[PDB]
């Protein structure tokens, strides 16, 4: 049994509407984790129960080096807490904003890890649906860790479809902006957007007004920098194909199509998951409490069932 009192609460790492993430130390072990704390009252009143139970189930039933693992999930009378592996290197969003653009080789390393994580997810019948720079963290070694599983859909195999209008606006696949249902190829669209941001230094489609933004996504052709390699242009054009049936990854073989693309020719896929590749950037933290890869905006801030049947959990690691 796990309680709030089993932890020291050190720094705010992130803060959504529906909760906050705090850097915590487990007192008995001296180990550090990221705790997501949600308020039950808010979760219930705002109809976020299904998403929260889904994130719990997904985290309970996945194990992969490029997904953040769940150590403990527990509840109190007014809170739900997820204790997860702490990604010390912060969000890819942090890094890309600092550096403006990544080399193709650096984007390839991250892209390959994301492809492996997506492959694994789809193999567990999970569609992730929210690939974006904020949800892609770096661990202490510089490997990708996908976080935030609340928008996942489970039990999606092969060509099964989904109906919920969800994700993040700037990253929505064109089929999601049409009526009716969509399949798992939405995840390859999201990879293409993040890859495009990594190698081109901006979103492929952007407007502050969601009506204009969604028009661009549906109707505008993407542009490439003249000096992007032909293989990177081809990868991006393939993942950002508007028709999911023509999209790279959109066919029956799903991730395999992406892994086979010439952009990834140099990648040994069997080695990606075994983490034999030296990452192109190791976070230079000087302590487990060093939050230099997280925004001051958050880290400066001080920190003063039936329905939830499938929630609680203790890992076998």
């Amino acid at each position: 049994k796990v309680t709030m009192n089993d932890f020291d609460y050190l720094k705010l790492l992130g803060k959504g509407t529906f909760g906050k993430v705090i850097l915590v130390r487990e007192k008995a072990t001296g180990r550090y984790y990221a705790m997501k704390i949600l308020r039950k009252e808010v979760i219930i009143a705002k109809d976020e129960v299904a998403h929260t139970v889904t994130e719990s189930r997904v985290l309970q039933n996945t194990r992969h080096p490029f997904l953040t693992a769940l150590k403990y999930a527990f509840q109190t009378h007014d809170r739900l807490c997820f204790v997860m592996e702490y990604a010390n290197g912060g969000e890819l969003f942090f890094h890309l904003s600092r550096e403006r653009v990544f080399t193709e080789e650096r984007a390839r390393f991250y892209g390959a890890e994301i492809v492996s994580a997506l492959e694994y997810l789809h193999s567990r019948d999970v569609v992730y649906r929210d690939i974006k720079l904020e949800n892609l963290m770096l661990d202490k070694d510089g490997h990708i860790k996908i976080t935030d599983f609340g928008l996942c859909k489970e039990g999606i195999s092969d060509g099964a479809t989904m109906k919920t209008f969800c994700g993040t606006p700037e990253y929505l696949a064109p089929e999601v902006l049409e009526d009716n249902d969509y399949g798992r190829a939405v995840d390859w669209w999201g990879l293409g957007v993040v890859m495009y941001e990594m190698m081109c230094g901006r979103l492929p489609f952007y407007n502050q007004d969601h009506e204009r933004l969604f028009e661009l996504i549906l109707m505008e052709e993407i542009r490439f920098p003249r000096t992007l390699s032909p293989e990177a242009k081809s990868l991006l054009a393939g993942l950002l194909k508007k028709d999911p049936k023509q999209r790279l990854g959109g066919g029956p073989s799903d991730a395999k199509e992406v892994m086979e693309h010439r952009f990834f020719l140099s990648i040994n896929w069997q080695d990606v998951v075994q983490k034999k590749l030296l990452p192109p950037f190791k976070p230079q933290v000087t302590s487990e409490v060093d939050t230099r890869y997280f925004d001051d905006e958050f880290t400066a801030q001080s920190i003063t069932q039936e329905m939830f049947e499938d929630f609680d959990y203790i890992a076998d690691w």
Binding site: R100, D130, E134, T164, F165, C166, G167, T168, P169, E170
Partner: peptide, 10 residues
């Protein structure tokens, strides 16, 4: 250097 984005569901 885009603004931070927000996930949603309807």
């Amino acid at each position: 250097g885009r603004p931070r984005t927000t996930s949603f569901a309807e």
